[PDB]
Amino acid sequence: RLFGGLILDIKRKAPFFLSDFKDALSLQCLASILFLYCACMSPVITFGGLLGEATEGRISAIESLFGASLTGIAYSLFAGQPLTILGSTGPVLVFEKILYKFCRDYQLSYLSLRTSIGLWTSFLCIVLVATDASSLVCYITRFTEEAFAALICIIFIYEALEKLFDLGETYAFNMHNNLDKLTSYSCVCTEPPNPSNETLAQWKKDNITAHNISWRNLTVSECKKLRGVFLGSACGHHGPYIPDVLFWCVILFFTTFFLSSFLKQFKTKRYFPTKVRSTISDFAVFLTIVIMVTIDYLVGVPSPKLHVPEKFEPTHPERGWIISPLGDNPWWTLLIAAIPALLCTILIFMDQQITAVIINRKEHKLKKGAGYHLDLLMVGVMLGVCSVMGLPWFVAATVLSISHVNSLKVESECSAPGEQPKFLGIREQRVTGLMIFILMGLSVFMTSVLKFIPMPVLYGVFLYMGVSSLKGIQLFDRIKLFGMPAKHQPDLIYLRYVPLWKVHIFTVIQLTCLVLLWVIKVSAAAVVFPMMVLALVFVRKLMDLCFTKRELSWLDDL
Amino acid sequence: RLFGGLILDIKRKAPFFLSDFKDALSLQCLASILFLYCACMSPVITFGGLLGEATEGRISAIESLFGASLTGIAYSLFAGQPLTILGSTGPVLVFEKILYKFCRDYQLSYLSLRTSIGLWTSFLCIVLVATDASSLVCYITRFTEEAFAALICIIFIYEALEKLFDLGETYAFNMHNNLDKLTSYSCVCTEPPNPSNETLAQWKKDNITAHNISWRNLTVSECKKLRGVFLGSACGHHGPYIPDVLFWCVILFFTTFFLSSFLKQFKTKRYFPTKVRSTISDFAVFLTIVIMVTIDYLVGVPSPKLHVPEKFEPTHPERGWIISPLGDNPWWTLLIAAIPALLCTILIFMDQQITAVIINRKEHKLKKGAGYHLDLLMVGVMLGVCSVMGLPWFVAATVLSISHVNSLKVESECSAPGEQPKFLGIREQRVTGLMIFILMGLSVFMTSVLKFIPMPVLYGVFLYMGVSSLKGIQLFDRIKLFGMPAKHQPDLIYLRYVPLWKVHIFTVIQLTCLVLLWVIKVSAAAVVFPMMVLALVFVRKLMDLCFTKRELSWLDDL
Ligand SMILES: *[C@@H]1O[C@H](CO)[C@@H](O[C@@H]2O[C@H](CO)[C@@H](O)[C@H](O)[C@H]2NC(C)=O)[C@H](O)[C@H]1NC(C)=O
Ligand SMILES: *[C@@H]1O[C@H](CO)[C@@H](O[C@@H]2O[C@H](CO)[C@@H](O)[C@H](O)[C@H]2NC(C)=O)[C@H](O)[C@H]1NC(C)=O
Ligand SMILES: *[C@@H]1O[C@H](CO)[C@@H](O[C@@H]2O[C@H](CO)[C@@H](O)[C@H](O)[C@H]2NC(C)=O)[C@H](O)[C@H]1NC(C)=O
Ligand SMILES: *[C@@H]1O[C@H](CO)[C@@H](O[C@@H]2O[C@H](CO)[C@@H](O)[C@H](O)[C@H]2NC(C)=O)[C@H](O)[C@H]1NC(C)=O
Ligand SMILES: *[C@@H]1O[C@H](CO)[C@@H](O)[C@H](O)[C@H]1NC(C)=O
Ligand SMILES: *[C@@H]1O[C@H](CO)[C@@H](O)[C@H](O)[C@H]1NC(C)=O
Ligand code: NA
Ligand code: NA
Ligand code: NA
Ligand code: NA
Ligand code: NA
Numbered sequence A, B: 001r002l003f004g005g006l007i008l009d010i011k012r013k014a015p016f017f018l019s020d021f022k023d024a025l026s027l028q029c030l031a032s033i034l035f036l037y038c039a040c041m042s043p044v045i046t047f048g049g050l051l052g053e054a055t056e057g058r059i060s061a062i063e064s065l066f067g068a069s070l071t072g073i074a075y076s077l078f079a080g081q082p083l084t085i086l087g088s089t090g091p092v093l094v095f096e097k098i099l100y101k102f103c104r105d106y107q108l109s110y111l112s113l114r115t116s117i118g119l120w121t122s123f124l125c126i127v128l129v130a131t132d133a134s135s136l137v138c139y140i141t142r143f144t145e146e147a148f149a150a151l152i153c154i155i156f157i158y159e160a161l162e163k164l165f166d167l168g169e170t171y172a173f174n175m176h177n178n179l180d181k182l183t184s185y186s187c188v189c190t191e192p193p194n195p196s197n198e199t200l201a202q203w204k205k206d207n208i209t210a211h212n213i214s215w216r217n218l219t220v221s222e223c224k225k226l227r228g229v230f231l232g233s234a235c236g237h238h239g240p241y242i243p244d245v246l247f248w249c250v251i252l253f254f255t256t257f258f259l260s261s262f263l264k265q266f267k268t269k270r271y272f273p274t275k276v277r278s279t280i281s282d283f284a285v286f287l288t289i290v291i292m293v294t295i296d297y298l299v300g301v302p303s304p305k306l307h308v309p310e311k312f313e314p315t316h317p318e319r320g321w322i323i324s325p326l327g328d329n330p331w332w333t334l335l336i337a338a339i340p341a342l343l344c345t346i347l348i349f350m351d352q353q354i355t356a357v358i359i360n361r362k363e364h365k366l367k368k369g370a371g372y373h374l375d376l377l378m379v380g381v382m383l384g385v386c387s388v389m390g391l392p393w394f395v396a397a398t399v400l401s402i403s404h405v406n407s408l409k410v411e412s413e414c415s416a417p418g419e420q421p422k423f424l425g426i427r428e429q430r431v432t433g434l435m436i437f438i439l440m441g442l443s444v445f446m447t448s449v450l451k452f453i454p455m456p457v458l459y460g461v462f463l464y465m466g467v468s469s470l471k472g473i474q475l476f477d478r479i480k481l482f483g484m485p486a487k488h489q490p491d492l493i494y495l496r497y498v499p500l501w502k503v504h505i506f507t508v509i510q511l512t513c514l515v516l517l518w519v520i521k522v523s524a525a526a527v528v529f530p531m532m533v534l535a536l537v538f539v540r541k542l543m544d545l546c547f548t549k550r551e552l553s554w555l556d557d558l
């Protein structure tokens, strides 16, 4: 029948609707909210700023904030597994870059074509929900759901490190200064000899006379605007050297990670009460942020800070929030815009479904059942709504969702004569995501407070999340201690039943696939990256050949 | 009889003399030498500089280096337990200060009186060796040998941290600068209006005319010498702000400690060969120094460096190395100088014997026997020699000796059946100390290489040594997990046979004594600090009262 899977999922999920809200009456829920609000805001603002730069000021940060708030609210209220956090995906930012120049190349209107493409993508997603294609989830095995996770976590860690490495270019220090000659250490703005006729043109259309302007007062920004030349002993590539800002950022970045790691380990200590070993051990990354913000405020070094937009009206002065599919375009662009819609729908479907498969793993001991058809239906509906309103596209994010799940773990009480309380289950609820995405939409009113949060602290939090998300994957348990290392082995039940060289070959097979994914990740096919989930399944099928089925579904499997 | 204990100790130690040299044919010996050379040099130079400042340039760093080399060589060649490292104690830099005002307030010669006092102290030490008073070692129990270790280690850690905290005063950064106004950020030396008549006097006896001198070129050191005034936007309390030197020092200090801790943990890893898990796991703090020196050289920020003196002749131009007891003093100062000799001999005897008791603990599983009379005899002989030559006094150091012993530990090669390799014994030898104290005396020729070692790296090494020396003390094993904490307990055999509240009272008794030692450590009695070892024994005697002897020598004396 049609819509049969959706009806079955709604019937399964309906009984637990009230329990989903009632189960959120503990402190760990507020701890997760405060943990994830800051860690989820920063990517949204960065993506919004990048898209506004790429689109000449059409889709800026405020539209990204509003779209994220709307999509998160309507996903947390009505969906399947509510522990999935929708988040702005890098890939998208690629799809606009080719699009806008395309709209610049011929003579087309960007917003109308984008809205038509989004509407047709939403229609195709609804059709896919009708056909019940999500049953293809039955084909994904542990092989993919333990490679993709490792690749995404490693990429996240590398991006977190690269974001810190980038700070050295903007804030360049002096590699060779004499501490005895500080009396002769200054930068001065002077007029440029024989300036380029381009700059002369600039001055003329700005009515700028070289002679009358005082040059010895112009500050760095004004000097760069007026195209001046710096002449001094503290000059650099472009602009005076910035003293002691980079190393303070490095100290902030590493101290935040180390302090969070230390504070998230009081559930193993013994010299404390039971209400102090689980109240500053579940609040490890919110106490860290406050402490580091206070330290940064006391020291007073001007490190980069978080800028949240203050206005509420749209960025472009003529962007009243509605976009008809066709207002300044020929009628055939609607019928041509459907061609990219198939690719976009397939890509979004595969990304959302692989994230849902990763989240609903059997090791998390889910009690309330999960549904895949409703997730895709609501993702498509909000994709259409966001496309009509002129808002950026949002799909599931893997690292954020894994960190959300890991923050609601429930552990038992004993552990000294035993160890690390046995994991009993994930706290199943719907208030955490709703509150996170409500607070995201209200950040326009709390700008005066969010301006005190330095960026290196957020980068350290990102690195901590990326490192902590690794714990749990089965891949590493082989990769770490099987391929090369030593001779003796741990228990590792799968060995209790199979040859060692077979395990080596199995690990090598996964490693080659991971390397291939990394190589073709950036390449020229980053546009169609997640489509590769259609390739690992083919390799898994072509593995029963030189593998007996017993070894096959004993060393993989689950 | 007379000298009986010395004869017995010589008879015990004679058989193993050749084995002591032959057992030093492994790599761990060179590893210990390279570990301890740098960690032992820096205190010597710092103490020498401080004493030269306090004595107006009579006993500078070069005399300290030469005295340390001589004393270490003659102690390693002929002594008892050769794992004790003689080192310049802090207490002395106080005697040799007061003894300076004196020789001035009155009208005495410093070197002659100091030599007479040292000679009489050496004579009293030889008499103590003759009387065989070192048998009083039989009275020291585990109670003291586990406080005086904990107190010394904690003091060492605090001093290592304070040495880093001190760097903020010399290199002061700017707590509030505007990054847009770097075009107006400079310091300028200008002539001081209505300068003090003191400075006028200075200029007159130096023939310095205010008018003709150019003030806009004088550098920071020249400006401070000429008593100028700084007038600019980058000025501070005294002198221009130093950009990005303090935070680089902090990064060096903490990175060295973290990297050393990480590198000294490859004896637990499993994904490496057996010749790479014990060649960069016993060379953990010498690879760290090289890596951090290379990083500091590549970055190029002018952090403080290690200054080793280059000259070989004595500091004062008339200090030909010999000092007759009386050359410019009345003949009764020799007979009066004996009064402080009793106190100095008692103090040195108690310090050396408590260090020897700590080192020769039964847990280290010493095979070759130890002797206490010969240690004191040779310490006294070299104290007399150093006093005659005009060199600073050297006695045993606790943290350095403990780190020397811990660096020669021999571990087994079986961690799979059981656990971490069971400690088999301390490698007993005499080449390590001899080579360390030979290399210390040759540092005057390798100044061009030692100048590249930054000081924060050495402070990080000091902190690592102070932290690692804590591991092993029984005190903490109670202090950590008995007094306040939780309800359940580990095995801890002493409990297998006694009341818990008794253990609490026992720990409280030790804590009160430790607090008293800390309080009277600085006080006004730091001169007579180690004499307190005569007080803990009295408390130990007055503990059998409200303690049955069974509980007493089951929880206490091991
Ligand atoms: C670059 O600036 C120069 C300097 O004013 C200008 O060069 C003139 O170029 C035109 C032809 O394009 C000539 O007829 C003039 O004689 C040139 N000026 C001189 C002083 O020789 C011009 O403004 C800029 N050059 C170009 C090619 O636009
Ligand atoms: C920069 O502008 C100021 C403002 O006129 C001038 O520099 C000095 O500013 C202070 C404070 O306002 C006053 O003593 C005088 O206005 C200026 N002192 C002088 C010129 O000796 C000046 O116009 C500009 N500075 C330079 C170097 O051109
Ligand atoms: C401090 O400098 C002042 C300024 O030159 C001097 O003060 C003179 O003090 C003597 C007595 O000590 C008087 O006879 C002079 O008349 C003082 N000078 C003036 C100008 O009044 C002197 O060099 C210094 N002061 C002292 C007390 O030594
Ligand atoms: C500092 O001494 C120098 C040396 O005479 C002078 O400053 C300039 O130095 C450069 C390089 O030697 C030369 O252009 C001239 O010697 C100086 N230029 C000038 C004075 O315009 C000057 O004597 C001193 N500087 C000041 C500011 O007094
Ligand atoms: C330059 O001069 C013109 C005419 O004199 C004037 O219209 C224009 O506004 C001036 N430029 C600026 C930036 O005001
Ligand atoms: C100052 O002048 C006197 C005599 O004119 C001279 O002896 C003295 O050397 C000069 N000062 C210096 C530092 O040379
Ligand atoms: Na990711
Ligand atoms: Na990231
Ligand atoms: Na994803
Ligand atoms: Na010490
Ligand atoms: Na120290």
Ligand code: NA
Binding pocket: B351, B355, B396, B397, B398
């Ligand atoms: Na000592």
